[PDB]
Amino acid sequence: TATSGSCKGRCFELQEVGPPDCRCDNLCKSYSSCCHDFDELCLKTARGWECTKDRCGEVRNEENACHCSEDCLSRGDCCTNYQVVCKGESHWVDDDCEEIKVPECPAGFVRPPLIIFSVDGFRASYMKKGSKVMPNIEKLRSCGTHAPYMRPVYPTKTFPNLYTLATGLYPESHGIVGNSMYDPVFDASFHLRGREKFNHRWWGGQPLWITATKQGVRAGTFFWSVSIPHERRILTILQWLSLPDNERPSVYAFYSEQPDFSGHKYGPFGPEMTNPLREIDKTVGQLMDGLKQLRLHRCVNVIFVGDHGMEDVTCDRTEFLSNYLTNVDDITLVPGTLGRIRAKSINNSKYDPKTIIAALTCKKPDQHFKPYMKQHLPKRLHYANNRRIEDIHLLVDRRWHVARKPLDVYKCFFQGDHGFDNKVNSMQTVFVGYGPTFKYRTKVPPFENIELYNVMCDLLGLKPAPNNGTHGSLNHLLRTNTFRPTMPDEVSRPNYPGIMYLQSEFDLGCTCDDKVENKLEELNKRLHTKGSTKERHLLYGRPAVLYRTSYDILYHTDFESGYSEIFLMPLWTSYTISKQAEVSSIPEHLTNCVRPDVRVSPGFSQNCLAYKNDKQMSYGFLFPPYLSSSPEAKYDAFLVTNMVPMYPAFKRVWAYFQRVLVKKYASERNGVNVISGPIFDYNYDGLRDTEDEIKQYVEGSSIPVPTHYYSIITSCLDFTQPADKCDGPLSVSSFILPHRPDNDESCNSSEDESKWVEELMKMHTARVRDIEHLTGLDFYRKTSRSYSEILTLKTYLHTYES
Ligand SMILES: *[C@@H]1O[C@H](CO)[C@@H](O[C@@H]2O[C@H](CO)[C@@H](O[C@@H]3O[C@H](CO[C@H]4O[C@H](CO)[C@@H](O)[C@H](O[C@H]5O[C@H](CO)[C@@H](O)[C@H](O)[C@@H]5O[C@H]5O[C@H](CO)[C@@H](O)[C@H](O)[C@@H]5O)[C@@H]4O)[C@@H](O)[C@H](O[C@H]4O[C@H](CO)[C@@H](O)[C@H](O)[C@@H]4O[C@H]4O[C@H](CO)[C@@H](O)[C@H](O)[C@@H]4O)[C@@H]3O)[C@H](O)[C@H]2NC(C)=O)[C@H](O)[C@H]1NC(C)=O
Ligand SMILES: Cc1cc(OCc2ccc[nH]c2=O)c(C(C)(C)C)cc1C#N
Ligand SMILES: [Ca+2]
Ligand SMILES: [Ca+2]
Ligand SMILES: [Cl-]
Ligand code: NA
Ligand code: NA
Ligand SMILES: [Zn+2]
C-alpha cells in the first residue's frame, strides 16, 4: 500500500481503489491500507455529535464532526439534532404517528431508499422488556409492521445469520456455516479474528448489494469497521443520501455490535444491559431526526432486524469430551454452543466416527448435548450439505457449552452466549419494517429470516437471485410491491387404474386370512374405489407432482393415495379423521395380512418375501389400519399398495403416532386431515432423490428404503369448525421423522412410547415447504384461500416452545 496518497474529497468512497492507490473506503482499516490522512479527514470528532444553541448559525469550520451552520442542510452534514436545537423542530420520536400511504420523497428519487438497521444479539423479548428505555424503536414497532419475533438460521451465530439476511440462503448453501470453519478443498481456515474471512471464496450465493448493482441500483457499504463510531456511520449514511441522483445509493446498511457485546459479559437481562439498549435507541433517534431534516422520514423504508438472540450461559455449564472419550487427543472440536468434530490428522486411519458417536451417546443421565451424524440432524435445520460441516455434530442444550477438555475453558469470563438450535426461544430475534412500502400499525406472525432477501428485493424493484425464501409468503408485510407468484405446473399427470389383475397373477409370498362374503353394498364399494369419499379425504386437492414420473391415483373408503410405480409405494397418502372417529384394533385374523391390489400389476408391487428375507427390515402402513371406518373398510388398509418399509425400531414410533397421536390431534383440533409419505434424501441436500441416488433397498428387491417419513396435519384455524367443513384460514403442523434402525437418539426409549415419541416428533417438526423440497410435491393446490396466504401456511413451523 502506497499510503501517502490522500483521502481528501474521498471519505467513505463507495468504489474500491486497487493497490498501490491507498483506500478511503471503510474496510481500509480491516486491511490496514487507509491513506495517511484518513483519521484526520474521515473520522473527525471535534465538538462531538450534537448542535447546541451557541453553535446555531456558526461559520462553517471543516474540522468539526458535524455542522450547525446555515449551509449544512444543503451540504447534508448537519448534526442530526440541528433543526431541533436551532430551528424549533420536534424530534421524530415526539411526533404523532401518521400513516405513510405513498412515498413522500424529494424530486429526483426514482424509488424509496431502503436502510437495513441491524443489531447484534437483539433478542426478541427486548422489544417488550426494554420498551420503557427504547422510545424510538417502540415508535417504529408500533407505527410500522412488526413480528413478535423472527427466527434466525442455525447456527444462531453472527456471520451465518447476517449473510443469510443478505442472500436468502441457508448457511449450507451460502457457505458461512459458522463463526469458525475449515474448508478441506481449500485447506484453509475461516476465523472471526484475522483476515482470511475477507477472502471471497468463503462467501457464496449472491448478496443483496451485488443483486442491486447488477440490476442498476447503487448500494452503500454493508460492512463497518469496529473503530468507526456509530454516530459517524449514521452521518455517513445521511451524507450519501444527500448525493446527486446519479451517485446516491438506494440501499444502505447500519450495524451495531450491541447489545450482543455486552450480552456476552452480563447475560441477556443483566442490569448492565439497560444502557446498551438506551444507546441503540439513541442511534435510531439520530437516524430518524436526520432523515426528517432531509425530508426523507416519509420516503425511506427502514428495516430494524437482529441476527440472533442471547441466552444465559456460564463456565460451569460446560460438558467436557474428555469425560466421555479416552481418545480425546485424536480429535479436533469446534467448540461452544454447538460441537463439530473431525479427526485431528487425516493420516490417522485408526480414527472411527462410529465409535466416537457411541462413546458420546446417552452416557450420563442428564447429558447436555446429543451427538449426530450430520445427515440425522432435524431436517428443519438444513445443516448438512456442505463440506465445511463436519460429519459429526453435537447439538448442545440451551444454557450449555461443550468443550474438548477443562484446560480449554479455564486457561469465569462470560454470562451470555448464542449459537443453539434456532427454535430455542432465547435465540429468537426481531423484525420491524417502517416506511411507505410497509403496512401501517400491523402485526404479522413470526417468520424466518431466509424470507427477507426476497422482500428487500421487492422493496427495491429487483429480481432476487435463486434463494431459499418462498417468494410471496411475506406479501402480507407490504402495502404495495407485492410479488404475485403462480402455482407451479404439474409435470406428471396421474393414471387412474381400474381393476386389471386377477388375484392368482400375484406371487408375492403374501397371505391374508380374508375369504368371507350383498347387492346394496356391492355398488357401495365400487363407488368408494371410484372416489366417492374423496372430497372427505382429499380436502385441499391432490398434490401436484412436479417432476417426470409414473404414478397412479388409488381411491378407497377411508383414504386416497398417489402410488409410485417407480418407487413401488405411495408418494403421498391422504385421509381425514373427524373428532368423533374411533380407534379399533388390528384383528387377529389380519395380523400379518397383506393383500394384492388388483388395480396395480405384480410387477409394480412390493412383495412379502423380501421382508421375510430381510432380517433387519419390516413394514408398516401409511393409512393406519387402527383408524378404519368399518370392519369392511379395514381390509383396504392391508393392500400391498399401502405398505412401506420400516425398521422395527421405527415401527415403535410410527405405531404410536398412528394409534394414539392422530386421534389425540383430531380431538384437540376438531378433526384433522393427514397426508403422509416417504422421503428419500440419501445425499442430504434437502431435495427429492432420483431413483439412481438410493443407497438402500429391501434385501433382494427393488423396494427402496426411505430415509424419512413425513406427515402434514391440517385443520381449521377456527377450531369451532370441523376440519372437513372449514370456511376460513387453515392451521398446520408437520414433521419429517428420520427412518432409523435404532432409537439411540431418544435416551428414554426403553420406556413406554408415551414418555419419548412425542419429544422425538417435536424435535423433527417441519414446514410444509421442507417436505415439498424433499418430495417434489406441491400441496394445498385447491383451497378457497389466497395463494400468498397458502405460501405463508407452507412456511409455518410449529416449534413447541412455551
Ligand atoms: C436453497 O437455494 C439454493 C439456490 O437456489 C439451492 O441451491 C442450488 O441448488 C441447485 C440444485 O442442486 C444447484 O444447481 C447446481 O449448480 C451447479 C453449478 O453451480 C455453480 O454455479 C452456481 C450459479 O452461479 C452457483 O450458485 C454455485 O455456488 C455453489 O458452489 C460454490 C463453489 O463451491 C460455493 O461458493 C457456493 O456457496 C455454492 O455452494 C453450495 O452449492 C453447491 C452445489 O452447487 C454445494 O456443493 C455446496 O455444498 C453448497 O451447498 C456454483 O458456483 C451445477 O454444476 C449442477 O449441475 C449438475 O447436475 C445436473 C445432473 O443432471 C446436470 O444438468 C449438470 O450438467 C451437472 O451434472 C454434472 O455434474 C455433476 C456434479 O459435479 C456430476 O456429478 C455429474 O456426473 C454431471 O456430469 C447443479 O445445477 C445450485 O448451484 C445451488 N446454488 C447455491 C447457491 O447453492 C438449494 O438447493 C436450496 N435448498 C433447498 C433445501 O431448497
Ligand atoms: C445488515 C447486514 C450487515 C452485515 O454486516 C455488518 C457487520 C458485521 C460485523 C462487523 N461489522 C459490520 O458492519 C452483513 C455482512 C454480510 C457484510 C456481514 C450483511 C447484512 C445484510 N443483509
Ligand atoms: Ca451476532
Ligand atoms: Ca437428495
Ligand atoms: Cl461456529
Ligand atoms: Na424382515
Ligand atoms: Na434409546
Ligand atoms: Zn455474540
User: What is the DSSP-derived secondary structure letter of residue 605?
Assistant: S
Query: How far is residue 778's CA from residue 791's CA, in Å, rounded to a whole number?
Result: 11
Grid cell at residue 270:
443483566
Give φ, ψ of 432 to 5 degrees: -135, 135
Contacts of 514 (CB under 8 A, 6+ apart): 589, 590, 593, 595, 635
- Contact criterion met (CB below 8 Å) for 400 and 314: no
Q: Which amino acid residue places its CA nearest to atom 93 of ligand 1?
A: 686
Whole-angstrom CA distances from 148 to 101, 158, 162, 419 are: 24, 21, 20, 20
Burial 113-134 (b: 16+ CB within 10 A, else e): bbbbbbbbbbbbbbbeebeebb
Euclidean distance between CA atoms 276 and 260, whole angstroms: 9
Rounded alpha-carbon distances, angstroms, from residue 670 to 301, 577, 578, 582, 713: 42, 9, 7, 14, 12
Active site (annotated) includes residue 795: no
Residue 120 to residue 113: CA distance in whole angstroms: 23
**Identity of residue 408:** D
Most distant pair of Cα atoms in the chain: their distance:
105
Closest Cα to residue 253, out of 361, 113, 365, 128? Answer: 113
Q: Say if residue 145 is exposed, middle or buried (CB neighbours under 10 Å; 0-12, 13-18, 19+).
A: buried
**Most informative mutation of 154, 173, 453, 795 for ligand 1 (most atoms within 8 A of CB):** 173
User: Which protein residues have their CB within 5 A of the ion that is ligand 5?
Assistant: 178-180
Contact assessment for residue 372 and residue 392, using Cβ atoms and an 8 Å cutoff = yes
Alpha helices per DSSP H over 601-657? 608-613, 631-637, 648-656
Q: State if residue 117 touches ligand 2 by the CB under 6 angstroms criterion.
A: no
Which ligand gives the minimal distance to the CA of 743?
Answer: 7
| Helix (H), strand (E), coil (C) string for 699-746 | CCCCCECCCEEEEEEEEECCCCCCHHHCCCCEEEEEEEEECCCCCCCC
The 3-class SS string of 159-214 reads HHHHHHHHHCCCHHHHCCCCCCEEECCCCEEECCCCCHHHCHHHCCCCCHHHHHHH
Give the Å distances, CA to CA, from 747 to 105, 516, 708: 60, 46, 20
Decide: 443 and 330 in contact? Cβ < 8 Å.
no
Going from the Cα of 158 to the center of ligand 8, the distance in angstroms, rounded, reads: 7
User: CA-CA distance, 206 to 214, in Å (whole number)?
Assistant: 10
- Candidates 626, 683, 704; CA nearest to 659 is 626
**Neighbour tally for 423: CB within 10 Å:** 22
**Bridge pairing between strands 145-146 and 150-151:** unpaired
User: Cis omega (within 30 of 0) on the bond before 259?
Assistant: yes
Resolution (A): 1.9
How does DSSP assign 740-783, residue by residue?
-SS-TT-TTTTS-GGGTHHHHHHHTEE-HHHHHHHH-EE---S-
C-beta neighbour count of 255 within 10 angstroms: 19
State which H helix or E strand residue 251 sits in: strand 251-259
Compute the distance from residue 704 Cα to the ligand 4 centre, in Å. Answer: 14
Domain range enclosing 546: 503-795
Are residues 393 and 339 in contact, defined by beta-carbon separation less than 8 angstroms?
Answer: yes
181 CA to centre of ligand 5 in angstroms: 7
Phi, psi of 622 (to 5 degrees): -80, -50
Rg for the chain, CA atoms, rounded: 30
Query: Which residue in the list 156, 158, 318, 799 is annotated as catalytic?
Result: 158
Technique used to solve these coordinates: X-ray
Run of H or E residues at 230: helix 230-241
- CATH code of 639's domain: 3.40.570.10
Count the residues in the chain: 802
